[PDB]
């Protein structure tokens, strides 16, 4: 029963908190929490590889790709391990995130603890954008907020 947490802070007003829970080893992982300060609509939501925050979110590096695969939506087989799709922020900018992903894990080869949770500016196209940047980052835009994922329990 491993519990993690991440506090997304950034230069702008976007900030929030996202906890992770895993009951089993190499099983499903719950990802729940709340972001605020975003614009209304779809924002990118990824787990980038490096847990660096020296030069800001640009220090986070690319999406967590251990298997060396192309970019896609979370429900697709061809996707980065760190690809969690998009989040929605309502008229208040309050993105209530609740997700269950069995691709990520708090342990093993797909461990995301110590990696950088990153929310983006625009939406991810889930790898169907029809160009080269959709097959890498997913044209989600810039990196509004980012935080190091650490153990909560």
């Amino acid at each position: 029963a491993t519990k993690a947490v991440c506090v997304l802070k950034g230069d702008g007003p976007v900030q929030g908190i996202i906890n992770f829970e895993q009951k089993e080893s190499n099983g499903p992982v719950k990802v729940w929490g709340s972001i605020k300060g975003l614009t209304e609509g779809l924002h990118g939501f990824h787990v980038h590889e490096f847990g660096d925050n020296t030069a800001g979110c640009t220090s986070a590096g690319p999406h967590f790709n251990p298997l060396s695969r192309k970019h896609g939506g979370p429900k697709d087989e061809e996707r980065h391990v760190g690809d969690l799709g998009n989040v929605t922020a309502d008229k208040d900018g309050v993105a209530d995130v609740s997700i269950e992903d069995s691709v990520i894990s708090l342990s093993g080869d797909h461990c995301i603890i110590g990696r950088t949770l990153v929310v983006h500016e625009k939406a991810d196209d889930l790898g169907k954008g029809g160009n080269e940047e959709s097959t890498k980052t997913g044209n989600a835009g810039s990196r509004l907020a980012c935080g190091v994922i650490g153990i909560a329990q």
Epitope: G12, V14, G16, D90, S142
Partner: nanobody, 130 residues
Framework: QVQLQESGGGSVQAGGSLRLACVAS???????????MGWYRQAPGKEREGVAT????????YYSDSVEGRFTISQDKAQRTVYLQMNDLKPEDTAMYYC????????????????????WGPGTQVTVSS
């Protein structure tokens, strides 16, 4: 710095219609920077109340309990201007109306509070006579 400026106020009969506009200038112009833009009402000898508030990242409007369906606040994002429609006025709304902006990630409840508000505007007087 994000500097605000209000206009549209004046002496209005009991039951008129007024348009309190506030055009933002300066500050960080990037679009992914959201604020909570609120109109606040200070009465001579009372405190800053706060009537309506609006989100610059979406379209969420909140109104205090002191105004029902009399006020209505909207936003032209393409002109960075916030409008407040004041109709069915009452002689108790005679006060000074200041427009201000706070952090767009303000928790609900702190959105219409003047303590959690950053930059403030100059202010204009809107008096209502009965």
């Amino acid at each position: 710095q994000v500097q605000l400026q209000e206009s549209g106020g004046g002496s209005v009969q009991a039951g008129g219609s007024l348009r309190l506009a506030c055009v933002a200038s300066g500050g960080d112009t990037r679009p992914y920077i959201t604020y909570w833009m609120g109109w606040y009402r200070q009465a001579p000898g009372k405190e800053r109340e706060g009537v309506a508030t609006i989100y610059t990242g979406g379209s969420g409007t909140y109104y205090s309990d002191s105004v029902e369906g009399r006020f209505t606040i909207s936003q032209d994002k393409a002109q960075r201007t916030v409008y407040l429609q004041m109709n069915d006025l009452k002689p108790e709304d005679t006060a000074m109306y200041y427009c201000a902006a706070g952090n767009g990630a303000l928790p609900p409840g702190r959105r219409l509070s003047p303590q959690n508000m950053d930059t403030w505007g100059p202010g204009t007087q809107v008096t209502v006579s009965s």
